[PDB]
């Protein structure tokens, strides 16, 4: 948990403590996932799943107390791509760029390309 | 729970603790969900659900006492594409680079970048 | 609940303390929802719903006591278009950049953005 | 209940502590909704109404004791458009924007907007 | 009741706590509403209702005491548009700048927002 | 009650804890009004009413013993506009830059405007 | 009662505890008015008046006994303009900017707003 | 009670214990005013009154026990310009500025100005 | 868990404590994995599972407690190739010459790079 | 743990802290591997194995309490060569120096690199 | 652990704190390999070992206690020759020049390297 | 440990900390090797041993206390000939002027040199 400033991420925590007054047992699980948010967003259901193993003992042998722990733990996170339209000056500026590309118009994308890196003309 | 300026933001925790009196069990589960907050928003129903197993003991085997455990949980959080249209200089800026680029007046688009990234001009 | 320099967002949570003298539990569920504050407002009916369960027993097997926990819980907070008129520099400057590219006077469009992004002029 | 510097909020809780002697149970429900100040206020009759469930009880089956819980909660908090005419600066400055631009006197939203961002002018 | 800071706000509580020997009940209701007050003031009568209902038991089924609780709460706070007319520089200065404006001299508004934003003038 | 440093605020309560030596009710409502107190203030009768139900029992149906409750309270708090002329330097400002502006001598304002926020002059 | 550092201020309390040896009654009533001390202050008779209900029991309905109430309390707290001629350094220089700004002498005004402000003059 | 520095203040209370063997009566009123003490003191007679009803019975209607309760109190607090010549500097250097105010010798008083604010001269 | 700029990340922890009363044990397992974020992302199940050994011992030989030890963790974070496809002006500008390249016209993959690296032309 | 700007890295630590009362052993092991990611990448299962011995004591010889240490431990970190096909500048220039190569035309190859480099042209 | 920069590299860490109430030994080894990551990569099993003495006592002589102690670590760390095919300008230049080299064309392989090292031609 | 941005390094460190209640010991060795990366690597077992003394004491002669001390300590770094085949424009630059070397084309390689070292030719 440490991406404060991520715009596209999951974050999630399972804790537990059990005891029956003579045995104790703590678990936790912490996971997160982050994504290019230009690219891709998190859009369905978020499923955390976890395992308890009732096979460890603490104390002598098989005649210690049963502690059950987590060995397997999973976590689903849908991964959808990025399609809002909402506009940016990068953005329209791209588009422009491709559109003078599709008519082999080079020159109009070296001009827009020449103002967007240094701010330029062609005849400065 | 990390994102203090994020801008749509779903965050969501259940907490429980049982006891019997020779028994205890607490059991917590946190998520949080975040998105690009230009190009998606949350809007609908948010839907928490956990599910308790009653599987699990502390103690002597199968004699032991009963601890309920979290070990699957879930969300829901509807992601709707944002449409909003109060005006931001950025958004209208790009507007009139998308309405240049549609004529083929890609000196105009050049133009209006020049501005932007500089605040120059033709001559300058 | 960590945001507090947010403009819109709704914030709840519903709190249990039940017990018999023999038995108790205690449930929570905290949730809390953010909007770009620009776009989109909170207005209508908040409201919240819990579900407890009675089939979640501590003890020994179905003999246990009974302790109702949550397992489902959701939210409603509606979600409409930000249509307030106060004016803001920014959103009157957008305006005009607005009603000048709708004339095709890129131009001018160019000398409002030159002036906004660095306070230059065409001869400058 | 986390916003302090918010300017337009609402905020309410409904607590109780309900006995008979034998059993107990204690409820409460907190909500908070805040707008941006500038385009929305609260103006009208704030409204809270909780149910309780007649159908949870502690302790053996269906002969437990009943105790009384909170499984739905609502508000009512009226949402207004701002309306205000004291004075700003930015709302004087972006109104005159605005009748600069209805007069398509371009150059005049520019000078306007250049003495803003850098307190500048055309000759400097 | 958070906001220490807050120029125009209502506060308001009711408390009870009722009990025959055998039985008891506590019950509290707080609600506060926040305004930006330069725009608009509290003025008019604070009212507060609260319902409360006779159909809640602890105990036994219809058999258990009766403990009164409060399910439905509402506030008045009359809200009205902010008319006081002590000076304030920058009130001041707004009402200067839309005397400019009203007359079309946008040279004079410029010079003011200049004077304003960087303490600059049209030489310097 | 929150606001120590407000300057125009009305506060006020009302307890009751009636008893007949089997049943017992103890009641209280507390109030808070504040007001931007440059621009209104309190002046006239403050007045509070609170009405006692008694249509409420506590212990078993129809049979149970009457134990008043509050279900409505009101206040009075006359709002009057500020009319006081200590002088400070603020609205003195404000009241020269009001008297430059009528005369429309916009640049004897924008010299008190410079002055004031950077303490500068027309030739620095 | 928390305003400790306040200038004008009136606070007021009304007490009481009666019994007959079986039943009793204890009423309170606490109320407070806060003023703006450089423009209003306190100044004539202060007054306070409650008013105590007899149609309030507690016990078997109309048979209970009787427990009067307080249903009404007002305050009277006369509010008078302050005209204290004691000199501050803020008021004469307040005095000093009108007087210069009676004779359309503004360069003065701004002059003095300047050594104010930040302590400077017109060749610094 | 609660202001410990204030320096022009009155405070009162009047308090009484009525028995006759089978009924009592407690009773108390507290006041208290403050002024802004650079500007106003009290000087006069200080002088409370309190009213008693003989209409309030506690018992059983028109045959219960008669227990006087106070209903009207009043306070007596004199208000006077303060007139004292005990020499502060902020005061004569008031006076300083007002005398060269009274001649239009603004030079001179935003050269006190300059040098109370700021601790500067004419040529730093 | 240094990685807080990352873009495309994976992270996970799992935590355990588990007693009996006269012993002990503590272990926990963290893991990250970062990749390139304009080529890979991760979309799928993220897992973890952890294996405990029961073959350790702490104190007098094999008569010592059992205390069990994580001796094999492991982790899986699906990569799949970048696909997201909204414009920035470096893309379109290497799409512009991709398709300039296919054509076998290098002068005007030569206009680009050289519009792209120094903002120059082909007569500058 | 150091690089915090890497772009393909793996992490991970395992760490125990066993004890029976009278003795005690903490251990850890942390690793971390990078990859330049402009070639390469992790791809697969993650995953981490340590060895403890129980031939270590502390104390009188091989009458000492029984410590278990780690004594060995690995790493996998699946590594795959990069094949992701988001378009930058750089790879596209590449590329097309490539083409341009294959058909022995090295003009073309310096003019692209003489744009590259300086943004030159051959008549500059 | 210095190098942040670094972009092929190994770094791993074993620490141990052995106590048996009278005397404790605390242990650890750092080590960090780094290449030349255009050349060589680190692709397979990460291996550490350490080795333990028990033949150091802190003491009387033979009589003291046993401490354990490190004095022998050893690393693992495959190295690969670097194979990815992603392009760089820099490697699609060499590659032209080798090509131009292959068939004796000294006079392309110049003009190249006159274009990379000055951006210049044949006949500037 | 000063090599930030060496290419080929090795770095090691053993610590310990040693004692037995009365008396303590804490012994460190750290080394560091540097090659120059574009000629040889480090590649194979990375090995450090360190040799402990008995034969040192703190205190009165040959009773003091026992403090083992390190005398000797070791390090294997393999070193291997660089073979890394990636190509840089140097490397493919030093290749030509070698194959134009082997057949006596000293011209060539006299024009090889002038390109790189000036960017000239043969005419220029």
Same mark, same amino acid.
């Given at each position: 948990?440490? #991406?404060?400033?991520?715009?596209?991420?999951?974050?999630?925590?399972?804790?537990?403590?059990?005891?029956?007054?003579?045995?104790?047992?703590?678990?936790?699980?912490?996971?997160?996932?982050?994504?290019?948010?230009? !690219?891709?967003?998190?859009?369905?259901?978020?499923?955390?799943?976890?395992?308890?193993?009732?096979?460890?003992?603490?104390?002598?042998?098989?005649?210690?107390?049963?502690?059950?722990?987590?060995?397997?733990?999973?976590?689903?996170?849908?991964?959808?791509?990025?399609?809002?339209?909402?506009?940016?000056?990068?953005?329209?500026?791209? !588009?422009?760029?491709?559109?003078?590309?599709?008519?082999?118009?080079? #020159? !109009?994308?070296? #001009?827009?390309?020449?103002?967007?890196?240094?701010?330029?003309?062609?005849? !400065?």
């Amino acid at each position: 948990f440490i #991406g404060t400033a991520s715009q596209s991420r999951v974050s999630a925590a399972v804790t537990s403590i059990l005891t029956d007054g003579n045995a104790a047992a703590t678990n936790s699980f912490a996971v997160e996932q982050v994504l290019p948010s230009s !690219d891709y967003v998190f859009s369905g259901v978020v499923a955390v799943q976890v395992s308890y193993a009732t096979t460890i003992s603490v104390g002598v042998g098989t005649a210690g107390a049963l502690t059950p722990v987590i060995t397997a733990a999973e976590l689903t996170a849908p991964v959808v791509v990025n399609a809002g339209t909402q506009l940016t000056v990068e953005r329209a500026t791209a !588009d422009a760029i491709s559109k003078a590309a599709t008519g082999s118009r080079f #020159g !109009d994308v070296s #001009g827009i390309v020449r103002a967007w890196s240094a701010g330029t003309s062609v005849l !400065d």
